[PDB]
Amino acid sequence: MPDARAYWVTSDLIAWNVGSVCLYASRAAAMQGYDSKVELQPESAGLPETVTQKFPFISSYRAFRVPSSVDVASLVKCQLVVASFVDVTGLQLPGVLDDMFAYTGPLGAVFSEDSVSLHLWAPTAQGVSVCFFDGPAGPALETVQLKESNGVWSVTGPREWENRYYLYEVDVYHPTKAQVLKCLAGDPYARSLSANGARTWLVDINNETLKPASWDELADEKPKLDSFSDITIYELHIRDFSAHDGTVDSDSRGGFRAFAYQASAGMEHLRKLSDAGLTHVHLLPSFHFAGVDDIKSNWKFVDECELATFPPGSDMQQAAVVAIQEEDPYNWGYNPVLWGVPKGSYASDPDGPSRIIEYRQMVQALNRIGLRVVMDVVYNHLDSSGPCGISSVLDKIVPGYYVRRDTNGQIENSAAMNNTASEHFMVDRLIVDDLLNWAVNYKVDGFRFDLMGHIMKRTMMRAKSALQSLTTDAHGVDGSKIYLYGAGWDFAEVARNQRGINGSQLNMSGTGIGSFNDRIRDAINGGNPFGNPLQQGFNTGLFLEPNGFYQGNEADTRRSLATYADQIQIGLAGNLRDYVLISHTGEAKKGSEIHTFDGLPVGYTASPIETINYVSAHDNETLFDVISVKTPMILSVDERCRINHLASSMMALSQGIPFFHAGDEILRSKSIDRDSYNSGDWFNKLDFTYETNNWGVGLPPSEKNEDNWPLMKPRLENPSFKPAKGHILAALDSFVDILKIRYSSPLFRLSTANDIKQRVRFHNTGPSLVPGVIVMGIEDARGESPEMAQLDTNFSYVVTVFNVCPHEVSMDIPALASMGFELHPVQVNSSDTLVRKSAYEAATGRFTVPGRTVSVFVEPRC
Ligand SMILES: OC[C@H]1O[C@H](O[C@H]2[C@H](O)[C@@H](O)[C@@H](O[C@H]3[C@H](O)[C@@H](O)[C@@H](O)O[C@@H]3CO)O[C@@H]2CO[C@H]2O[C@H](CO)[C@@H](O[C@H]3O[C@H](CO)[C@@H](O[C@H]4O[C@H](CO)[C@@H](O)[C@H](O)[C@H]4O)[C@H](O)[C@H]3O)[C@H](O)[C@H]2O)[C@H](O)[C@@H](O)[C@@H]1O
Ligand SMILES: [Ca+2]
């Protein structure tokens, strides 16, 4: 977009950072060449507080008054410049468009008894018509003019318009082309589409033929959720789930329908996890995104049997995958086009109703096996901008409004590309309207907000209120149980609240909305995903087992290990700002007083429900891969498997909300791909036969990985690094056991900061702490005249020992001596021979824990 350094902030005020200012307008975009010239006098009252609160980054700008004689509604449809006498620049219009034309009425389609209405917000447009098609691929049948009122274009037609397909013909000034262009655009409020969103389907989302059997009774069948503190999350990509599952019919692999195959290997796997206690599945982007063709017959994919013949450390597999990666069935989907419609490529038929019905059937099916469904929502950026292409919708209709721009008028791209501006009224409105669409129309149980730091906190909080007030009687869903969390990363143009108070980790403290705890992730794994890949952490051999490629000294690494242990313990106690820990110096510190290496407070939340504890996710290296990179090369795969289990167990037995990447439980590899978003089914394989974990399938794609190929190649080629079926199955068995343990006692899932401060203590702390061991005790009411509520009818105390040392340790804890501790019944019965050797001795309060083991001890009541 061109140079635009001035802002039209309200109907009567323009803001521009100058030290004789005039406004020029041309309806034909001919600019000399203007239709209208207007002198702007300096406004001695300056910018109102409402303006500076909305746009903090321009609070220093001088104010200029637009005379009340000006027809603002007409001028915003023109090419506009302001001039200072000579400096000429364009005008950024969102302020005035909101001030004059903010609209809360119906958008998209409204169905009444005898009519269908369409409304489009397009306040800068010179004309809007609707072009109707009979059929998803047929020719235009008729064009109907819409009428404008206050920036909204509308038309009401007969009920027979239902199930037509349509597009809007929008005549609008596009700054990138310096022309008024006739753009063919989909409906921002679309609820279904033809293939690839080429046209919008004029569907009544409430139509009974779009509901699976018993859909209206789904609320009655949903899994009970007593508390947000009972949540565990499993993060899964829809295509990954079934792309390689031979127990699913070829036709139904990779999409929504595979979730309706009860006895498939995949659904049996999810059943196993759900029955162990898993509560929520977080599905990667499942709305209309670009980068995958909805027409399956257009897909190109490599012969996997061919690629299997190539050497494990070769660059040939990735070259083959990359050659057709833009035309294959595969993308994570963080490329938003239209938020309110299910992705067509995941439907059996991308035209008509199947994408709606099959999405609903997926939610129903997951609910019926005991899993609530979370959507990964991506409101922070758009795939495309500008007037051209099927994949640009929002910016095609109202250019320069839905996207955030810098102070020169250029689109901000920190999110990926085409950052949105949730600070603008109709963007905020669309986001919340979309969330309510998914909650009511699809009965979705929660939302993970991609780049939540790019979203205004006021949008997050309004979304929370709107969702959690939905009721079964009025909306068919219990909104009180809908859970929100997100990745509250604070960077680029939204950092330091520059565009308003944003959804950063620190800003979302005390909101009851969760955020990913990167502190526990980095302390466990070591380093960070964008630092040195060989930097070790608490669970990857720092100090105890140096890898010999990296390091510092060993008083360095001993203290570095202890520093990481402190960070982990704060996270294990819900990552609270006010939780007090005896730190490794011996000084007692609040969680917020302990800092990361970038000076960030480690603990920042006001509640465990605000913490999403993780070591792995779709981004960056899988758990198995990060362990395989960072640990000494000489470790056996058997040892690394125990290390995998330790990491996932630290999550599963933490206070807060545990988050697992799909495949944590089965040693999933991507052959060390750090960003597999476009790396195809080959690198992203999820193998529910358990025969392979996808280690050693070639060097991963060069685009994101080539700099690290030298460390990857020898490991990928080393047969000693590759697990067998037995290892994979053992990992799954111990994973399920640890989930069962979490759900065996309410003590692991405390619901408030007060409860955690009262009940949770760590017993291996201070300057003489034993390296590589964390001991965590959780107390319940005991004796007559109890001190606290009794939460657990079975156990009066639980102790977890995490031992990352390669050798057995004995921890003597006097505070826990002379008690009735025994190994947890689940671990007494474990298929793992080692954990069964764990023991407690009352005389000394001694907990004996084998090397590379997590041992859970319980004090039974009576
Ligand atoms: O945003 C681009 C960036 O995305 C990924 O980066 C992740 C990162 O891996 C993850 O760890 C975290 O980073 C934070 C870190 O964890 C914190 O400790 C702290 O240090 O702050 C960090 C953030 O500053 O989050 C990052 C963002 O991830 C999330 O957002 C992404 C955008 O929605 C999404 O990225 C995926 O999708 C995009 C779009 O398809 C894709 O981008 C490709 O295409 C773009 C053209 O549109 C082009 O500009 C990019 O250059 C190209 O890569 C990403 O590759 C793909 O991962 C995340 O999935 C979502 O969770 C990623 O790892 C980086 O490689 C990438 O540069
Ligand atoms: Ca692809």
PDB file of C-alpha atoms in Angstrom, residues 298-386:
ATOM      1  CA  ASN A 298      -6.210 -31.859  -7.979  1.00  0.00           C
ATOM      2  CA  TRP A 299      -3.847 -33.130  -5.273  1.00  0.00           C
ATOM      3  CA  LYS A 300      -0.381 -34.332  -6.185  1.00  0.00           C
ATOM      4  CA  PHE A 301       1.551 -36.460  -3.773  1.00  0.00           C
ATOM      5  CA  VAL A 302       4.762 -38.420  -3.777  1.00  0.00           C
ATOM      6  CA  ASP A 303       4.885 -42.197  -3.835  1.00  0.00           C
ATOM      7  CA  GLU A 304       5.787 -43.013  -0.210  1.00  0.00           C
ATOM      8  CA  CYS A 305       7.036 -46.471  -1.208  1.00  0.00           C
ATOM      9  CA  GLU A 306       9.553 -44.725  -3.505  1.00  0.00           C
ATOM     10  CA  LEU A 307      10.706 -42.344  -0.775  1.00  0.00           C
ATOM     11  CA  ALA A 308      11.090 -45.285   1.652  1.00  0.00           C
ATOM     12  CA  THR A 309      13.918 -46.652  -0.514  1.00  0.00           C
ATOM     13  CA  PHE A 310      16.061 -43.509  -0.053  1.00  0.00           C
ATOM     14  CA  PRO A 311      18.793 -43.423   2.648  1.00  0.00           C
ATOM     15  CA  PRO A 312      17.777 -42.170   6.137  1.00  0.00           C
ATOM     16  CA  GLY A 313      20.128 -39.147   5.997  1.00  0.00           C
ATOM     17  CA  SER A 314      19.610 -38.317   2.314  1.00  0.00           C
ATOM     18  CA  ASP A 315      18.382 -34.941   1.011  1.00  0.00           C
ATOM     19  CA  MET A 316      16.333 -36.696  -1.715  1.00  0.00           C
ATOM     20  CA  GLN A 317      13.100 -37.190   0.245  1.00  0.00           C
ATOM     21  CA  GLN A 318      12.767 -33.477   1.026  1.00  0.00           C
ATOM     22  CA  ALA A 319      13.626 -32.465  -2.539  1.00  0.00           C
ATOM     23  CA  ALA A 320      10.826 -34.745  -3.781  1.00  0.00           C
ATOM     24  CA  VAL A 321       8.312 -33.444  -1.221  1.00  0.00           C
ATOM     25  CA  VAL A 322       9.258 -29.774  -1.798  1.00  0.00           C
ATOM     26  CA  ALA A 323       8.888 -30.105  -5.591  1.00  0.00           C
ATOM     27  CA  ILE A 324       5.084 -30.512  -5.259  1.00  0.00           C
ATOM     28  CA  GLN A 325       4.464 -29.100  -1.756  1.00  0.00           C
ATOM     29  CA  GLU A 326       2.282 -26.259  -3.146  1.00  0.00           C
ATOM     30  CA  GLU A 327       0.011 -28.773  -4.928  1.00  0.00           C
ATOM     31  CA  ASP A 328      -0.230 -31.536  -2.305  1.00  0.00           C
ATOM     32  CA  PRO A 329      -2.999 -32.308   0.223  1.00  0.00           C
ATOM     33  CA  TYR A 330      -1.013 -30.835   3.088  1.00  0.00           C
ATOM     34  CA  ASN A 331      -0.820 -27.706   5.183  1.00  0.00           C
ATOM     35  CA  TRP A 332      -1.202 -26.912   8.887  1.00  0.00           C
ATOM     36  CA  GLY A 333      -3.626 -24.195   7.715  1.00  0.00           C
ATOM     37  CA  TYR A 334      -2.432 -20.989   9.407  1.00  0.00           C
ATOM     38  CA  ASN A 335      -3.448 -19.111   6.195  1.00  0.00           C
ATOM     39  CA  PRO A 336      -6.864 -17.610   6.887  1.00  0.00           C
ATOM     40  CA  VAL A 337      -9.321 -16.653   4.163  1.00  0.00           C
ATOM     41  CA  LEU A 338     -12.768 -17.081   5.758  1.00  0.00           C
ATOM     42  CA  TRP A 339     -12.991 -17.928   9.442  1.00  0.00           C
ATOM     43  CA  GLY A 340     -16.625 -19.098   9.615  1.00  0.00           C
ATOM     44  CA  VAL A 341     -16.634 -22.036   7.201  1.00  0.00           C
ATOM     45  CA  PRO A 342     -15.215 -25.573   7.563  1.00  0.00           C
ATOM     46  CA  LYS A 343     -12.219 -26.361   5.327  1.00  0.00           C
ATOM     47  CA  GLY A 344     -13.473 -27.949   2.092  1.00  0.00           C
ATOM     48  CA  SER A 345     -10.442 -30.202   1.568  1.00  0.00           C
ATOM     49  CA  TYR A 346     -11.406 -32.037   4.785  1.00  0.00           C
ATOM     50  CA  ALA A 347     -14.963 -32.660   3.518  1.00  0.00           C
ATOM     51  CA  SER A 348     -16.077 -35.553   1.297  1.00  0.00           C
ATOM     52  CA  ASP A 349     -17.559 -33.048  -1.222  1.00  0.00           C
ATOM     53  CA  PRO A 350     -16.354 -29.414  -1.201  1.00  0.00           C
ATOM     54  CA  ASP A 351     -19.624 -28.201  -2.773  1.00  0.00           C
ATOM     55  CA  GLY A 352     -22.914 -28.191  -0.887  1.00  0.00           C
ATOM     56  CA  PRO A 353     -23.664 -29.279   2.657  1.00  0.00           C
ATOM     57  CA  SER A 354     -21.136 -32.057   3.377  1.00  0.00           C
ATOM     58  CA  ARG A 355     -18.527 -29.776   4.986  1.00  0.00           C
ATOM     59  CA  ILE A 356     -21.141 -28.566   7.518  1.00  0.00           C
ATOM     60  CA  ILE A 357     -22.682 -31.968   8.276  1.00  0.00           C
ATOM     61  CA  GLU A 358     -19.306 -33.747   8.523  1.00  0.00           C
ATOM     62  CA  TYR A 359     -17.780 -31.099  10.828  1.00  0.00           C
ATOM     63  CA  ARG A 360     -20.751 -31.538  13.163  1.00  0.00           C
ATOM     64  CA  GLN A 361     -20.435 -35.348  12.953  1.00  0.00           C
ATOM     65  CA  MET A 362     -16.751 -34.989  13.960  1.00  0.00           C
ATOM     66  CA  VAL A 363     -17.563 -32.922  17.061  1.00  0.00           C
ATOM     67  CA  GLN A 364     -20.345 -35.359  17.937  1.00  0.00           C
ATOM     68  CA  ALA A 365     -18.061 -38.382  17.499  1.00  0.00           C
ATOM     69  CA  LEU A 366     -15.256 -36.930  19.612  1.00  0.00           C
ATOM     70  CA  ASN A 367     -17.742 -35.883  22.345  1.00  0.00           C
ATOM     71  CA  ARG A 368     -19.174 -39.414  22.346  1.00  0.00           C
ATOM     72  CA  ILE A 369     -15.751 -40.962  23.114  1.00  0.00           C
ATOM     73  CA  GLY A 370     -15.324 -38.521  26.006  1.00  0.00           C
ATOM     74  CA  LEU A 371     -13.363 -35.721  24.326  1.00  0.00           C
ATOM     75  CA  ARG A 372     -14.284 -32.054  24.140  1.00  0.00           C
ATOM     76  CA  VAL A 373     -13.191 -30.259  20.980  1.00  0.00           C
ATOM     77  CA  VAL A 374     -10.979 -27.179  20.823  1.00  0.00           C
ATOM     78  CA  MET A 375     -10.515 -25.171  17.639  1.00  0.00           C
ATOM     79  CA  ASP A 376      -7.222 -23.515  16.728  1.00  0.00           C
ATOM     80  CA  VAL A 377      -8.424 -20.041  15.745  1.00  0.00           C
ATOM     81  CA  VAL A 378      -6.192 -17.726  13.714  1.00  0.00           C
ATOM     82  CA  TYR A 379      -7.536 -14.176  13.985  1.00  0.00           C
ATOM     83  CA  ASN A 380      -4.138 -12.472  13.929  1.00  0.00           C
ATOM     84  CA  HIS A 381      -3.456 -12.436  10.165  1.00  0.00           C
ATOM     85  CA  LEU A 382      -4.760 -13.163   6.676  1.00  0.00           C
ATOM     86  CA  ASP A 383      -3.428 -15.323   3.871  1.00  0.00           C
ATOM     87  CA  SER A 384      -3.807 -12.540   1.329  1.00  0.00           C
ATOM     88  CA  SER A 385      -4.532  -8.863   0.898  1.00  0.00           C
ATOM     89  CA  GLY A 386      -5.437  -6.661  -2.054  1.00  0.00           C
TER      90      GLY A 386
END
